Amino acid sequence: KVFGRCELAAAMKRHGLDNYRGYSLGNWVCAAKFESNFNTQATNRNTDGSTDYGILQINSRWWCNDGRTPGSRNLCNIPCSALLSSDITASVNCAKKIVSDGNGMNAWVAWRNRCKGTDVQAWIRGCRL
């Protein structure tokens, strides 16, 4: 599924990401835009042989099992393919664990280089939330 910007804001807010560990909603929308372009089906290989899955490009090196990432963990207890569903629940609950693990949203490369320090409120402008 390709979410609309405000559609995604609303689903993320419903799922409790608005100020989750202090990260306002626009942070999560901006990360999603630059990670997946709001596309749940997005997949991208990393240099280390792991793959990133879904709307938040969650990594098989630590968080999910894709059956092909040797020497990795599965800390969200899920197949990586769950992260590609039109429904974002698994991505969001997994996101909550990642962001809670001490490095906050710096876990998302795209967040650190494209959202951090910017006016992320712009990402929810116009949305009914």
The CATH number that applies at residue 82 is 1.10.530.10
Instruction: Tell me the resolution in Å.
Output: 1.7
101 is in an annotated binding site: yes
Q: Please choose, from the candidates 119, 44, 103, the residue with its C-alpha nearest in 3D space to the C-alpha of residue 95.
A: 103
Short-list 113, 41, 105, CA closest to 51: 41
Question: How many domains does the structure of the chain reveal?
Answer: 1
Residue 69, by phi and psi: left (phi above 0), alpha (psi -120 to 50) or beta? beta
What residues are annotated to the active site?
A: 35, 52
Question: How many C-alpha atoms does 81 have within 13 Å on its Cβ side?
Answer: 3
Cα end-to-end distance, the chain, whole Å: 20
- Residue 61 and residue 118: Cα distance in Å, rounded? 28
**Domain containing residue 41:** 1-129
The token duo for 52 is 């990133």
Experimentally, how was this structure solved? Answer: X-ray
- Collapsing DSSP to helix, strand or coil, 5 comes out as helix
